[PDB]
Structure formats: structure tokens, C-alpha cells
Amino acid sequence: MATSTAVFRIGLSDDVEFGLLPPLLRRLRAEAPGIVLVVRRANYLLMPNLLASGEISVGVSYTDELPANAKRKTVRRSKPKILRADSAPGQLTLDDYCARPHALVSFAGDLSGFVDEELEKFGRKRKVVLAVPQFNGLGTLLAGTDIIATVPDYAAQALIAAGGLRAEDPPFETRAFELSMAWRGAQDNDPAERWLRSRISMFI
Amino acid sequence: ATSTAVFRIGLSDDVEFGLLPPLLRRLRAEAPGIVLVVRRANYLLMPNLLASGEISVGVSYTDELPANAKRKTVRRSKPKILRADGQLTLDDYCARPHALVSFAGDLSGFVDEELEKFGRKRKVVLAVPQFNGLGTLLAGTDIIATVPDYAAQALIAAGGLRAEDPPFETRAFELSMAWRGAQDNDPAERWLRSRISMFI
Known about the structure:
The structure is a homodimer.
Chain A: E1 7-12, H1 16-31, E2 36-41, H2 47-53, E3 58-62, E4 70-76, E5 80-84, H3 94-99, E6 101-105, H4 114-121, E7 127-132, H5 138-142, E8 148-152, H6 153-162, E9 166-168, E10 179-184, H7 191-201
Parallel strand pairs in A: 1-2, 1-3, 6-7, 6-8
Antiparallel strand pairs in A: 3-10, 4-10, 5-8, 5-9
GO molecular function (chain B): DNA binding; DNA-binding transcription factor activity
Keywords (chain B): DNA-binding, Transcription, Transcription regulation
Organism (chain B): Pseudomonas aeruginosa
């Protein structure tokens, strides 16, 4: 692989890109200086599209369902986290949660999510005032407001690292998709792709 | 001011990164009850979201405009070079490795078209979809990136990088706001386009 000038196309969740990419880039550069990396944005909705269409060979993303012609590997289990920016003492109760306005990380413009689906089961609801298509930058949008966001704990970690937010366990149970490495069945055999995937796994 | 309506806007990665926070602060200050949906769309994907009705207004580099649609320039082009290592000469610029940001999966960008006019070329070694975290990405490397000035301002504010003017020029980073002609009369939509235009 040292003499390779091949171009590689991978898909990454926007939060995963912060931690995975810098150490990864250094490894491929040092051992395969001719290879070019193209990173596409990935989420659990675009993930089957990116694989089935050929836009990426492998992705590291939150994943829900994948095409039948796709292999996958869990890289990290997720639990939900509440993010807030106000200064009120104490953890949010369920009543507090349902009364405050919410920011939703929605990858296709929906104003409701799985949290709303779960709250509806118990006859409760919430008001979403903001839908954003990514995780990063969310702290700049919540700052100085009482808007709260419900995100996977991996995204929460990166957003807490960005500063200005508090993280807590939600006052109820909701979904949190796994972080996965997923690739298409055809490329399980490929040595160049096996090599890239083994290099990604060296850092996550 | 008392509006509680839902607005759906499309923004490229550079605009969502550097300009959405000031825009949102101003939108919420005037109309605290509005609901905002932001869709991510680069300069090639944007027109599809406008034609399909997924958004009512988009902000991106100049692209294809669907039928019935209108556009207006909202910010002039001012690119900046970012570096983590004096000012870079043109020969240094064409010799350093380049990271390309959010060009829909391609290995070419606007700068490649500009350099060709001098019979020059560059080497793109990396393509990423986001501007946030570029500092930690270029840290300890000779890789440079060429971003719009509003993205450079936010990235320099986080520390670790230096920003310079490029050794050539380009209108290619001009921001244009596009919308459908059917919504050209909606007072709520025209309020929104008015505020986007003002707060650039």
C-alpha cells in the first residue's frame, strides 16, 4: 500500500470526524503518502444511500438499518444525554423537560423525533423550536437560552468538550443508536479496503 | 414579531458554521416564537431542496436555479488562506498540500479553476465536508485550506491558525440567496429573506 495513489471515499458522522480524522490522517500519510482521502457526511438516514450508491466504501456513523449487502461492526454503544445551557440548579424533571423548548438534530427536516414518539406513548409532548442537521455548533445555538437538546452520549462528549453546556441523564428512557462501522459485502474481500478499515479501527 | 410560524432554510456548511449563530440570535430577538428548520445542502444539492419544497430559501455559492426561482447576492467573495505552520507567496501556495472543504465529494474546487488562469496547479490531498475542527485537522502539518472569510474569522477565534489573503482573486465565494417565485409574495417569507439579507 506504500506505493498506492488510490483515492478512498469514507462516510463519517460529524461528531466522529473531530476525534477520528486527525490521528487517522497522520497514519495513512506516513505509510501511504500517495493516497487521497475523501470524507462524506454520514448519518443513519443517508448511510444506506451512501453505501448502495457507491459514494463511500465504509462509514463510521450512527446506524439504524443497513442494506442486506452490507457488513457492519459495532464500535460504540450509545446512551441518550440531555444538553442544556441555563444556570438553574438541579436536574431536569420530566415536567421540566416537557415544558422547555427543544432543539432537534434532524437529518431530513422533521420537527419530531424518537423522543416525541416515546413521549406520545405516555400521553406527553414537547415543543421543538429548532431543527439542525448536525451535532457540532449546537452549543453556540443553545447558549443564553433555555432550549435543550437530546443527543447520543458520544455527541454529548464532543459538545461538552466544546464548552458552555451541562450534560445529564434524561428523566425518561429513549432510543440511542449505536456507533457502527459499516461497509458493503462486495468489499469485504478487497485488500485495499480491508487495509483502510483496519486503519480506521486502529483509532476507534 | 408575534409570529409562531415554521421556516425551512437551506445552508451550506460554511454558512451554517460561521453565519447561522449571529443570524439565529437576531431572528430570535425579533420573533421569539418562530420555529426554524435548517437543512444542510452544499452548492450543488441546494437547488434540489428548493425545487422539491424542502426549503423555502437557500444560501450558497452560485449554482443552478430551478424554474420560477429567483436569486440575490447577499455577501461578496473574500477568501482566506488558513495555515498552522512571513506571508505565503503564490509559489508556496501552489507547492503546499491543500485540504478541500465541502465540495460534494470531488477533488477539485474553485481555486483549481482560478489557478488554471495563470497556468498553475495545486495538489489536493484531502477532502472533508465540514469547516468546524479544521484547526485540529491542520495542526502540526503544512496542509493549508482556502475558506470564506466568515469561516476563517470563527476558525481563527478558536486559536491555532493564521489567516491571510490569497495571492490571486475570485468572485467564486460570493454568497447568493435563492427562493421560489411562488413565495415571492408571502409577507412572512419576505420578512425572513429580508432578515437573512440584512444579517448576511
